[PDB]
């Protein structure tokens with residue numbers, strides 16, 4: 166059968182779904198999703214600034230279509246995300262003159278947003294990313310407007326609110342590069358200090374935006390262990406593997422430059438050679454060996470897309486590259502990495 170049944174006894178197999186896919190209108194992705202995944206996450210549609218215009222006004226079409234889809238196919242559904250510094254309008258934070266509104270006023274906007282959003286899907290969504298990406302890459306609390314107006318209380322109040330709205334909801338914190346030493350620890354710290362405040366939190370999302378070579382598997386492992394120790398369920402939430410030239414490690418004189426589209430940084434436009442098909446299978450296989458090792462700690466592994474043609478890495482971090490990060494190709498056909506992963510479970514020894 167599919168991924169989901171292969172991994173039934175391990176964890177949920179999930180896909181982020183764009184709004185075209187959430188519409189139901191692609192029978193070929195319906196057939197695929199129904200076979201392969203049992204968990205879905207809205208890739209964009211339940212984000213503050215996508216869901217609401219700059220005046221706080223709500224359009225629920227896509228948000229509603231996504232919940233109709235998972236109800237329809239009976240898939241576990243993750244809300245993404247109540248409180249985040251990205252894809253949210255500056256009018257949330259700032260007067261037209263640039264100045265920041267009071268904390269009190271922003272609290273009120275947060276109350277309303279969580280109350281309406283979690284409230285509306287209370288009991289339909291099993292899980293929420295309540296706060297997304299609150300630790301800076303300099304390993305300090307990210308200097309978002311959330312943070313600058315509110316402090317730790319934006320995260321605190323966000324969870325407490327969420328939990329009051331849907332008591333039943335599994336409530337996560339979600340971040341990227343927390344596979345990595347340094348930011349892993351600053352996040353463990355962050356949870357700890359809020360958990361001693363009594364903040365209701367149930368899960369820790371590891372985004373899992375990985376590269377073909379890095380981070381190493383020992384890294385990821387340390388993080389699975391650190392976070393579960395905080396008495397939380399571990400999720401891999403935005404899984405994909407970047408197979409393109411990295412701009413992450415570039416010399417000074419090229420901080421951008423580095424985001425500009427350049428030929429050589431897009432080397433596989435004519436197709437992914439077999440030699441890299443293979444590095445990608447092997448890298449997915451290492452990851453999933455790891456995940457199986459620790460499936461007492463991991464509740465779910467979600468991919469940040471269904472197929473390559475629809476991966477966000479085609480445009481991040483350089484617009485318009487041809488990447489190959491996911492299990493299904495641009496023709497919806499499964500890739501070498503896919504069979505390696507069925508095989509792990511198929512041939513498993515007990």
Ligand SMILES: OC[C@@H]1O[C@@H](O[C@@H]2[C@@H](O)[C@H](O[C@@H]3CO[C@H](O)[C@H](O)[C@H]3O)OC[C@H]2O)[C@H](O)[C@H]1O
Nearest residue numbers: 183208209297372403475476477478479480481
């Ligand atoms: O390719 C163009 C564009 O990218 C995609 O939407 C993007 C989302 O996938 C992206 O998701 C975040 C990835 O980082 C973290 O996991 C974070 O938690 C996610 O929200 O968000 C930015 C979007 O531009 C679409 O495929 C398409 O619109």
Ligand SMILES: [Cl-]
Nearest residue numbers: 183184208209
């Ligand atoms: Cl979308």
Ligand SMILES: [Cl-]
Nearest residue numbers: 433436437438
């Ligand atoms: Cl090639």
Ligand SMILES: [Mg+2]
Nearest residue numbers: 236288289290
């Ligand atoms: Mg339901």
